[PDB]
Design a protein around this motif. Sequence first.
Motif, PDB file in Angstrom:
ATOM      1  N   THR G   7      10.985   9.092  32.640  1.00 40.07           N
ATOM      2  CA  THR G   7      10.670  10.009  33.733  1.00 40.07           C
ATOM      3  C   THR G   7      11.415   9.645  35.019  1.00 40.07           C
ATOM      4  O   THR G   7      10.836   9.099  35.963  1.00 40.07           O
ATOM      5  CB  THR G   7       9.151  10.093  33.997  1.00 40.07           C
ATOM      6  OG1 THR G   7       8.618   8.782  34.211  1.00 40.07           O
ATOM      7  CG2 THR G   7       8.443  10.741  32.820  1.00 40.07           C
ATOM      8  N   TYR G 118       2.095   9.080  35.594  1.00 41.17           N
ATOM      9  CA  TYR G 118       2.919   8.983  34.389  1.00 41.17           C
ATOM     10  C   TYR G 118       4.289   9.663  34.574  1.00 41.17           C
ATOM     11  O   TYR G 118       5.265   9.296  33.909  1.00 41.17           O
ATOM     12  CB  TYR G 118       2.192   9.561  33.163  1.00 41.17           C
ATOM     13  CG  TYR G 118       0.758   9.092  32.991  1.00 41.17           C
ATOM     14  CD1 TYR G 118       0.400   7.764  33.222  1.00 41.17           C
ATOM     15  CD2 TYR G 118      -0.236   9.976  32.589  1.00 41.17           C
ATOM     16  CE1 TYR G 118      -0.910   7.338  33.068  1.00 41.17           C
ATOM     17  CE2 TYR G 118      -1.547   9.559  32.432  1.00 41.17           C
ATOM     18  CZ  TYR G 118      -1.879   8.240  32.673  1.00 41.17           C
ATOM     19  OH  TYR G 118      -3.181   7.822  32.521  1.00 41.17           O
ATOM     20  N   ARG G 121       5.976   6.667  37.203  1.00 44.50           N
ATOM     21  CA  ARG G 121       6.140   5.340  36.607  1.00 44.50           C
ATOM     22  C   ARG G 121       6.796   5.470  35.225  1.00 44.50           C
ATOM     23  O   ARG G 121       6.394   6.309  34.418  1.00 44.50           O
ATOM     24  CB  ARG G 121       4.785   4.627  36.487  1.00 44.50           C
ATOM     25  CG  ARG G 121       4.774   3.198  37.021  1.00 44.50           C
ATOM     26  CD  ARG G 121       4.086   3.098  38.378  1.00 44.50           C
ATOM     27  NE  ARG G 121       2.648   2.838  38.254  1.00 44.50           N
ATOM     28  CZ  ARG G 121       1.765   2.909  39.254  1.00 44.50           C
ATOM     29  NH1 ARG G 121       2.144   3.245  40.485  1.00 44.50           N
ATOM     30  NH2 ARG G 121       0.482   2.645  39.018  1.00 44.50           N
ATOM     31  N   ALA G 122       7.788   4.627  34.954  1.00 49.21           N
ATOM     32  CA  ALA G 122       8.632   4.766  33.760  1.00 49.21           C
ATOM     33  C   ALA G 122       7.994   4.276  32.454  1.00 49.21           C
ATOM     34  O   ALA G 122       8.226   4.865  31.397  1.00 49.21           O
ATOM     35  CB  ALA G 122       9.964   4.059  33.977  1.00 49.21           C
ATOM     36  N   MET G 124       4.937   4.282  31.377  1.00 44.48           N
ATOM     37  CA  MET G 124       3.903   5.176  30.854  1.00 44.48           C
ATOM     38  C   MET G 124       4.512   6.546  30.555  1.00 44.48           C
ATOM     39  O   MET G 124       5.223   7.104  31.396  1.00 44.48           O
ATOM     40  CB  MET G 124       2.781   5.330  31.888  1.00 44.48           C
ATOM     41  CG  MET G 124       1.914   4.089  32.064  1.00 44.48           C
ATOM     42  SD  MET G 124       0.278   4.182  31.298  1.00 44.48           S
ATOM     43  CE  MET G 124       0.648   4.871  29.684  1.00 44.48           C
ATOM     44  N   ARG G 125       4.235   7.085  29.370  1.00 46.17           N
ATOM     45  CA  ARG G 125       4.642   8.454  29.053  1.00 46.17           C
ATOM     46  C   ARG G 125       3.570   9.434  29.522  1.00 46.17           C
ATOM     47  O   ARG G 125       2.410   9.052  29.681  1.00 46.17           O
ATOM     48  CB  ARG G 125       4.901   8.639  27.550  1.00 46.17           C
ATOM     49  CG  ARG G 125       3.668   8.655  26.654  1.00 46.17           C
ATOM     50  CD  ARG G 125       4.009   9.213  25.280  1.00 46.17           C
ATOM     51  NE  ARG G 125       2.931   9.028  24.309  1.00 46.17           N
ATOM     52  CZ  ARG G 125       1.913   9.865  24.115  1.00 46.17           C
ATOM     53  NH1 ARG G 125       1.790  10.982  24.828  1.00 46.17           N
ATOM     54  NH2 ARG G 125       0.998   9.578  23.196  1.00 46.17           N
ATOM     55  N   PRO G 126       3.954  10.703  29.751  1.00 48.91           N
ATOM     56  CA  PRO G 126       2.943  11.734  29.979  1.00 48.91           C
ATOM     57  C   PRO G 126       2.127  12.002  28.718  1.00 48.91           C
ATOM     58  O   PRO G 126       2.604  11.757  27.609  1.00 48.91           O
ATOM     59  CB  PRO G 126       3.771  12.977  30.342  1.00 48.91           C
ATOM     60  CG  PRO G 126       5.110  12.467  30.736  1.00 48.91           C
ATOM     61  CD  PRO G 126       5.321  11.224  29.932  1.00 48.91           C
TER      62      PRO G 126
END
Lengths: 250, 196, 195, 226, 204, 231, 241, 243, 244
Positions: G7, G118, G121-122, G124-126
């Motif tokens: 992200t 999400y 921050r990289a 954590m995935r959505p």
Amino acid sequence: MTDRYSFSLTTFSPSGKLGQIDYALTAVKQGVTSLGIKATNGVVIATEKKSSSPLAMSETLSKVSLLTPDIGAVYSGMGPDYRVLVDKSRKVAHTSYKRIYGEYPPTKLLVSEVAKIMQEATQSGGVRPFGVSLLIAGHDEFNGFSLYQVDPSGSYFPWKATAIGKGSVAAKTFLEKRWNDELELEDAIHIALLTLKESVEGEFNGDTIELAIIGDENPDLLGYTGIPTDKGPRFRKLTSQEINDRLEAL
Amino acid sequence: TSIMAVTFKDGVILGADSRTTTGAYIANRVTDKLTRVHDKIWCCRSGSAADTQAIADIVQYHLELYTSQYGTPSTETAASVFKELCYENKDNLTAGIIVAGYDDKNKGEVYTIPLGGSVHKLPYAIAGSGSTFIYGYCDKNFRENMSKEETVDFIKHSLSQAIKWDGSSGGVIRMVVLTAAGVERLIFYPDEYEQL
Amino acid sequence: MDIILGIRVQDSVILASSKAVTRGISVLKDSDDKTRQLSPHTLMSFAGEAGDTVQFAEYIQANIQLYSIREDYELSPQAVSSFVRQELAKSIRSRRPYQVNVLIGGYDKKKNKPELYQIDYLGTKVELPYGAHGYSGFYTFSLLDHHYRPDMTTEEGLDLLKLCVQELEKRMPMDFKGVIVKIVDKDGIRQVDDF
Amino acid sequence: TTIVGVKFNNGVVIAADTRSTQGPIVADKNCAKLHRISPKIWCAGAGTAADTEAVTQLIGSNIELHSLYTSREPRVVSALQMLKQHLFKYQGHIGAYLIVAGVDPTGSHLFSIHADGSTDVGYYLSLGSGSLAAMAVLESHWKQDLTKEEAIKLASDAIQAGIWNDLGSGSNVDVCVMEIGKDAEYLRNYLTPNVREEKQKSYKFPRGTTAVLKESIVNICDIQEE
Amino acid sequence: SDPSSINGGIVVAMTGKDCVAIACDLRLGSQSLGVSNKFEKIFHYGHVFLGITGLATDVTTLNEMFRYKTNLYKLKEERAIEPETFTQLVSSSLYERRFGPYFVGPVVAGINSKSGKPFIAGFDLIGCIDEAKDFIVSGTASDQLFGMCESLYEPNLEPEDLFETISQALLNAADRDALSGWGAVVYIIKKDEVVKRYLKMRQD
Amino acid sequence: NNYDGDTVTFSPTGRLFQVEYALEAIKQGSVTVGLRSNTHAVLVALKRNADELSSYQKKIIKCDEHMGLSLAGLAPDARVLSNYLRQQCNYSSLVFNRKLAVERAGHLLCDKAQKNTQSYGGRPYGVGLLIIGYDKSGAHLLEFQPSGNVTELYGTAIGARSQGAKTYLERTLDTFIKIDGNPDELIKAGVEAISQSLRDESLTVDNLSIAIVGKDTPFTIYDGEAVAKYI
Amino acid sequence: GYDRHITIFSPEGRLYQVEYAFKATNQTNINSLAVRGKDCTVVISQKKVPDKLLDPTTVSYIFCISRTIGMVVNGPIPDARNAALRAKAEAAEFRYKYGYDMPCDVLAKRMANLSQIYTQRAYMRPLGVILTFVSVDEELGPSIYKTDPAGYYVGYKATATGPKQQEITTNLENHFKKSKIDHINEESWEKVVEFAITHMIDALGTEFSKNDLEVGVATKDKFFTLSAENIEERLVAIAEQ
Amino acid sequence: TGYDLSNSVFSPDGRNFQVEYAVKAVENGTTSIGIKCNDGVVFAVEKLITSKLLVPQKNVKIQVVDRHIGCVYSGLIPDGRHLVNRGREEAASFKKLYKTPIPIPAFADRLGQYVQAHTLYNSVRPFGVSTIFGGVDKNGAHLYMLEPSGSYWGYKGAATGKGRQSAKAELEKLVDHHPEGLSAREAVKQAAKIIYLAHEDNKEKDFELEISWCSLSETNGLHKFVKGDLLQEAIDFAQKEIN
Amino acid sequence: GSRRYDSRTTIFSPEGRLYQVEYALESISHAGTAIGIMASDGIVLAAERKVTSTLLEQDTSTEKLYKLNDKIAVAVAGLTADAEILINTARIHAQNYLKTYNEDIPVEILVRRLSDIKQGYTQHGGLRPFGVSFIYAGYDDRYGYQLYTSNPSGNYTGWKAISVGANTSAAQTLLQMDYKDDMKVDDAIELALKTLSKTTDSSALTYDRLEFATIRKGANDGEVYQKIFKPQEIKDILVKTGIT
Ligand SMILES: [Cl-]
Ligand SMILES: [Mg+2]
Ligand SMILES: [Mg+2]
Ligand SMILES: [Mg+2]
């Protein structure tokens, strides 16, 4: 697990560009137009309530937010990023100022704190920059009325009047012709409405426009009486009706 | 305090006085010591008011979160959550709690949790400073499978004596009835129970 | 340890410190030097709890010597004293505080003035014409109040110091085995080997 | 210190005396013990004066942030819950004894908090060294369905009992009325029954009475130009 | 043993017509032993004055601390701190050491540069603000100072009359306290001039 | 190919290449044999030297009085895993006054090796182990792979050319299982089994390594002239 | 092209991982609908049990978050349950700290803030889900607030989610254009559920049995789901007029 | 492309390819099944005899959680063990705080959330197992099946591994031919048959049958392994059906 | 895992250069020119604001010149937001030193501290460096008037006259030509403005496009005064020196 992204995701390219900040500014450019104008006795900030669906209740989505009783903010770009910044900005106004000095921070210093948060997201590990540009209007005893713009990089500049987002280039030209140092607040609201009409396609009324002012103290909005020195908030969000009244004299 | 919980044919009833003390001064003469941790799981509080209020609030939070995930908890489960807090923090607490509840499967149940943090499942339970004076009376007069009216009279008479002898107890007698029918609150004033 | 005195005259600072070290029942040593040179023109005497005194004095010494090398410059007596005060003021709210009282005598080469600073274990600093710690002041201050002049010579300062030590030797119950005397002036630090 | 809280028809009133003491000495003769948690949630404090304001402002600050986050006017139970959990954590060492009162979308409320985080509910409450004198008046004259005018009268009468009979309390009576659907009115020095009489003599000195050694101008200004 | 009465000393502050006054003795001691007659207890950060009684090491430490904080304040705010704001900073700073406090009795005095209004305030060791209209007292002879101020004070005194009142309040209070005296200083503060006067007093 | 850079990555066919590459290190290692009867359990291990001046690398490690293993692959990894077994055997004795079961010892080794195959940064163990032991349910033989897979067997072999010894044991299954109360004959069967994996070289006095554990026999290792009897 | 994996911004100012999470939302091929009455808020969702070996009682995308709040999810069940567990924990903590039941719109904001994190921050995935929260709030009355992977949320008069959301959306839009009010003017919740099912039938063009639907209802002080037999009674009433 | 190189990355489809690759490891494993009966559940698994040197009945695959839950899985065996170890911790903390043994649906979510958590980050790999588990609680019998994605549902019958299609077909027949239900002892017999029929996909090597069960009447709601005469009776029934 | 996305900000090139430092310097070369000139009786700091607007509030604006304490000031060239992070750290360090030693911090000690912070970002932490170059103008009683510069590498050097930002090559040549050692402040003011006027990329140099500051002992008796010039005062000095 653990956050193993402890390194910068924003870095200098050979040409000296910080790619992620530039790309964040591109996201701001795509965003809906918002503007701010400073008068002798007040400041106005305005934007379009671009409703995603007609079934959605656009009153529940606030684009213009109170930060302190005398400071307000509006944005262009990614709405969610704005929402969390408003939460952080409200809290930092208390933790790093009001709980120390027993008073709300002046406009320039709160802006400085918001800028710091946005700068850190440009250098810290495992994060991207915020995809918003803020316009923060406010008043304080020793600096008077003021208007500030804050960018994804963390840079901030004071303005007499300005616009950000979709049709900012055309809007800033419109404001240059109309702005002078003798404007009353009502004149600035009038100019704000004229400027904003150019960038709006569809409906233009109190329900599709969000507009707030930093003006006189509102003792009617204080909630209590008995302390002479407490005279009420200078931030006031205009109602749907109050906007439409000024659209007839447009 | 004088508190008690009594199981009967249709479920269980909790009983309590209403006096809170700081020394000889009655800081509150109309206190509510019967407290709700779930729809049909209540408790009686004795000891430090701060401690028993803090514990009851935490238990209510635990059982609310339990309910959202696993459905209605048992009275035994509620007693275990109380015990876990009282036992693991025995050095820093002064709390004597009686847990009472109504299931449809298990019907009326009573669990008493003294100072140490131990659990004891009983047909009926008494606790608080005023309970000492009615051990004899309650042991002689308790029967299993009483009716609602008999149980109310048993609790009313019992707490009446506890109040009469214990300076720490007094005020109104509050009661909470837990059955399949629902939750009923009762109150009895001095002019009523003193002449018994 | 026991008695530490200090006096600032016209053009120098004089520090006097006892020589005895006592382990309860016996006097283990009678030639102990209760002082450390912090820099070429700054001297610090000390007295307090056993062990803590030297440990503190040497710790300060190392820090000032480190500063001197880093900047190639000698800190002023005022600057050194402030550093020392902060360390003691930090110490008093620690787990185990330094139980150490000090006198800092220095000659400021910029202002061409001698300076005497008295700092107790709490971090209480005062600049003085003459100072002491413990019970030493109780015996000596009445003499210093009478005879002291700001324009005294170094030789006159030593004579007034002898009168103070004589009064201590007469009225104090403890035998502190005499004093080592050191002078701090524009030329640096030297010891008076006969006193 | 004497502080009281009294419920009435359409709201709640709190009151307090204005004396703060350092042992047997009166430090301030016109102290302000009625604190604002939010516009329509006020509380009165007894015990350690620094603790009562510190804990009030901390919770008041968090209540304001909570109100902004939720887009809702703050509730008294929120202030109560946040205060008790804070005080319980510190096991009584934060010596704050509070009477918390206010109005919110749920209605009007009145609670008291003790330093150990124990709370209670009531129609009339009193706290502080003069609480027994005040409670005597409250137990004698309180009834159900009091009017606004009756509640203010009862509250101030209870504070007066503290003022006159308790040595820990004195000077003036402060009141705050919180009515439903109205702004809270803070009545500072609602009663002033302790004005000092004129002195028998003026103690203004002739100029030049005090012996002076040195005079000098103090430079408060910054470093100047040129 | 009692930290607040090891070193000794007193501070008093008063208001007048378009002016304020703050004064202190000059003694520093080790209980019975008098150590210094030049230990001033009044400091100033811009036009805001701060007196501090109590344990001397903390007096020095707090002065250095508020100098630190008012300097950073000035750089960021681009203006000098006002008495009302400074008072809140002292209160905050003391309360952050709630369970390990500085053993002091601070006193703030100054005139607001914008409104011109005279201001004074006092604190306990833990941060509680006492903001009186008339006068503030602090130190080992606070009882004596309360007695002097309560009788000698009248409102709206002119600067030169106020000087005589506060000076006589301090001097006669200090002479009834073993741990106060050895000299005294009085500050008379107007909106854009401040006069500092050392007083002649008995030296026992 | 693109999916073998680390242990946290499955291939499109659901394979873990880093684990398979760790398995490959075992095949390069020297041969070692394990077999048991109902009374005793035996390890036989062909030790490997660097050259003629060098010593022969030790292959067998004792874990307790009643348990031990032989290794094939990265020796330092065997030292780490064997140290862990020594501790677990020891924890069982100190806390529960109980000798650790051989089956439970296998379960602990499986779980320790598994954690290294599912997390980023780490790597799989590069060694295979043959654990023998005598506990409350008699003699046991286990085979450990660094994928985590632990298997209980009558007999087996791991390392280079281990297929020859494994086939021999598969034929001899009915004979050697019956060798009860005769340690010498059970070792003879193990030495004859490992001999099916030799090429060019033969079993010498400093080449061969044997270990045994049984009913009234603590885990003991035989090296040097102590194995000349079986050559 | 690693700006499409984590992200961070693309050159166009876009977050592709967020956009692809929106696409995962429709992986279940289920459509949901939510409407408001006078005293209630109703939410309906398609139920599909393709395997005969499945226990149909355990197949659900509607969750009871608190006593007052209900949540329907559009997306894969693992992410749906992830969000559910968290929302339940947040609602409980809120009540403990602030002494009153967490409002529907406040929970929506809180979950939306978590979703926003999400997207920034990289590591954590959505979550590939769209969360529709429903309640009868004690202050605001009947409430519908919907959250998505971008961290966006807003209140609704009514709403629809899924592969065929546009058809349902336009159907609802046309109804409220006639009535000129922000809700279904109906006293009982039973009839509001009948309205919801009817207008879904019209929009999608499909008929439903008792096992083809899943219904949730929010009233004052409780949210509950309907059984198959409660839905059958609802379908019978629709057919009889 | 490159979307399949890292875990927790959405492809342009909205898919997590790494989770889909973990499924391939599950499909490669041996067949395992679960059957929900009248008052309980039955689990069974195929164990491939790679060699004569494997000690019969010793390499046990089915695992117990607490005293009332059984777990069986297909795919990477170590991953399955790691998941069960977590499950045992989850069940232990539940019983510690709430006294009662963990309900099966509650337990199902605990595993589900844990497996789902391993699809949220690139610093961890998804689980290479599908787990069939269940047991008896206060509300009766439950059977669940949990995938690498974290997805789980309740089941009447469940199957996974290399012979899952064959097994599923056999389970579907039982559901149709027994709407009133199946007894515990019947389910053990049927479980044996289904594994034997599902062994046609792994016909190269011979195999060993392993069965377990929880039943309110037959085992008092506790998990137990099928042993001795009852196991041999099920093997005989199975062998009779294939011929 | 995460390694895949790491830019590795703290590594050497094959030639022994720090990639990120070099690229940060390239960024700074596009920033508005800042000049510092040191004289016997004071120091001058002049700096050009970047392409402004008529609607920018100039009198309340600050992007170039910042006050560190009463004796020391800095001119900024690069990312303004990055500079403010460092400036606040420097302001604290000055106050720490004052609290410890009860003396104003010597200029070089402050410069070394900031420069060491910049160095750290090039050697460890994996973060991008600060895209900022400073000119430090200050006074202390040891070395008197001092000019320094620091850049993203964390290297600092002393100067009699120096420029940072855009067109430093051209600017440094012009300063090297007209600078003399016995120069005075009023002369240095004129040199600074004349240099900017010739090197600027704008059409003409006006008051609204400048920030200006002087550090003078032109304060009543032995003490130092900092003067941050107001817009009207910059307009006056432009007329005085004959540029407008
Ligand atoms: Cl949040
Ligand atoms: Mg009684
Ligand atoms: Mg005396
Ligand atoms: Mg991400």
